[PDB]
Amino acid sequence: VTMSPESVVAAAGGGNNNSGYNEPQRFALVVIAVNHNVIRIMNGSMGFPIL
Amino acid sequence: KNLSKCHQNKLKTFARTANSGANPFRPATAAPQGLSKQPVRKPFASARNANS
């Protein structure tokens, strides 16, 4: 990921009143993945054949 | 045809529930009770008799 000049200037301070970036800013990258799975029901109890 | 990067054979595992929790169990063994001779045995006191 390549960031933006607005982000790099918001990370530094120097903002005036009611500007949002009046204080140094910290950022956290988060990634999530939605995937498939298989659930087998047998003999009344559940289990994961592939886990 | 093929690729210049071998795909390693990752380990394959599966999860078995086996034993259940507590819902479809109850005691499931009727009410088995009863005990053998208790450690503190009670002595047999002498049996006295009372008459006029």
The residue assigned the tokens 């009143």 is A17
- Rg over CA atoms, chain A: 23
The answer to whether the Cβ–Cβ distance between B17 and A45 falls below 8 Å is yes
For residue B18, the chain A residues in CB contact (below 8 A) are: 45
Chain A: closest CA distance from residue B2 (Å): 27
Half-sphere exposure at residue B13, Cβ-oriented, CA atoms within 13 angstroms: 2
The residue assigned the tokens 């006029």 is B52
Resolution value, angstrom units: 3.5
- Stated as kind and residue range, the H or E segment containing A47 is strand A45-48
Q: How far apart are CA A21 and CA A5, in angstroms?
A: 14
Method: cryo-EM
User: Minimal Cα distance from A48: which residue of B?
Assistant: B15
The answer to whether the Cβ–Cβ distance between A44 and B24 falls below 8 Å is yes
Q: Using CB atoms within 10 Å of the CB of residue B11, give its burial: 0 to 12 exposed, 13 to 18 middle, 19+ buried.
A: exposed
- Stated as kind and residue range, the H or E segment containing A7 is helix A5-11
